[PDB]
Design an enzyme around this catalytic site. Structure first.
Site, PDB file in Angstrom:
ATOM      1  N   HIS A  89      -8.837  -0.078  -1.212  1.00 33.54           N
ATOM      2  CA  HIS A  89      -9.228   1.320  -1.198  1.00 33.54           C
ATOM      3  C   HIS A  89     -10.022   1.753  -2.416  1.00 33.54           C
ATOM      4  O   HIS A  89     -10.581   2.853  -2.379  1.00 33.54           O
ATOM      5  CB  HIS A  89      -8.022   2.242  -1.022  1.00 33.54           C
ATOM      6  CG  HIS A  89      -7.184   2.409  -2.242  1.00 33.54           C
ATOM      7  ND1 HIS A  89      -6.071   1.635  -2.479  1.00 33.54           N
ATOM      8  CD2 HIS A  89      -7.255   3.296  -3.267  1.00 33.54           C
ATOM      9  CE1 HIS A  89      -5.512   2.008  -3.623  1.00 33.54           C
ATOM     10  NE2 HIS A  89      -6.205   3.020  -4.118  1.00 33.54           N
ATOM     11  N   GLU A 101      -4.855  -4.312   1.944  1.00 33.89           N
ATOM     12  CA  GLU A 101      -5.271  -3.715   0.681  1.00 33.89           C
ATOM     13  C   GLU A 101      -5.742  -4.744  -0.338  1.00 33.89           C
ATOM     14  O   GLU A 101      -6.001  -4.379  -1.488  1.00 33.89           O
ATOM     15  CB  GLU A 101      -4.129  -2.873   0.103  1.00 33.89           C
ATOM     16  CG  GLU A 101      -4.096  -1.420   0.613  1.00 33.89           C
ATOM     17  CD  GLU A 101      -5.457  -0.711   0.547  1.00 33.89           C
ATOM     18  OE1 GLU A 101      -6.004  -0.341   1.619  1.00 33.89           O
ATOM     19  OE2 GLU A 101      -6.004  -0.544  -0.567  1.00 33.89           O
ATOM     20  N   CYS A 145      -5.543   1.520  -9.872  1.00 31.90           N
ATOM     21  CA  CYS A 145      -5.515   0.547  -8.803  1.00 31.90           C
ATOM     22  C   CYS A 145      -6.546  -0.549  -9.032  1.00 31.90           C
ATOM     23  O   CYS A 145      -7.615  -0.320  -9.623  1.00 31.90           O
ATOM     24  CB  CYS A 145      -5.750   1.205  -7.455  1.00 31.90           C
ATOM     25  SG  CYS A 145      -4.242   1.983  -6.847  1.00 31.90           S
TER      26      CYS A 145
END
Length: 172
Positions: free
Chosen positions: A30, A54, A138
């Site tokens: 993402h 992911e 992230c």
């Protein structure tokens, strides 16, 4: 953790990614820019791209980081062992957060997320920026030592409201 290890952590999209070798780069799906024609100045036709949930892996045809040795990318983190999340902050701090790794999980945050869960070993409640992970983190790599060598097993994807639980995306 050593200087060369931190130098593999690279700003990327809305987060970070990690150079596993001179040609392999991993990140969290993402944070990956969409609708683009290049990454790191290289055209898509010279990058092997594989996104699985992911977890996103890029393999460049060009040797992008020849200063680096190739490290082992594990298919997930060894359950029960302590890893470090190599967090870089855009204000300059380096924050290796210790985490004990748990099981493959799916959980609802705020949306369902799927990856390997872990528990931060940084404090009683790891809420906030000094003891836990925050938006922007992230893609940071989950690493641990095997013998004399460092290995990487996941990239940061999520954390619960209390902040004690984190989820990394894993290759398997």
């Amino acid at each position: 953790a050593p200087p060369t290890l931190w130098s593999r952590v690279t700003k990327f999209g809305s987060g970070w990614g990690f150079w596993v070798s001179p040609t392999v780069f991993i990140t969290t799906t993402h944070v990956v820019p969409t609708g683009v024609k290049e990454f790191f100045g290289e055209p898509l036709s010279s990058i092997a791209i594989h996104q699985a949930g992911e977890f996103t892996q890029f393999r460049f045809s060009k040797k992008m980081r020849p200063d680096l040795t190739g490290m082992v990318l594990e298919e997930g983190c060894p359950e029960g062992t302590v890893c470090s999340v190599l967090i870089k902050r855009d204000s300059g701090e380096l924050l290796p957060l210790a985490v004990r790794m748990g099981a493959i999980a799916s959980m609802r945050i705020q949306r369902l997320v799927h990856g390997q869960s872990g528990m931060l070993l940084t404090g009683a409640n790891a809420k906030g920026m000094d003891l836990g992970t925050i938006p922007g983190d992230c893609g940071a790599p989950y690493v641990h030592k095997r013998g004399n060598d460092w290995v990487v097993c996941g990239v940061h994807a999520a954390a619960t409201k209390s902040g004690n639980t984190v989820v990394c995306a894993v290759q398997a």
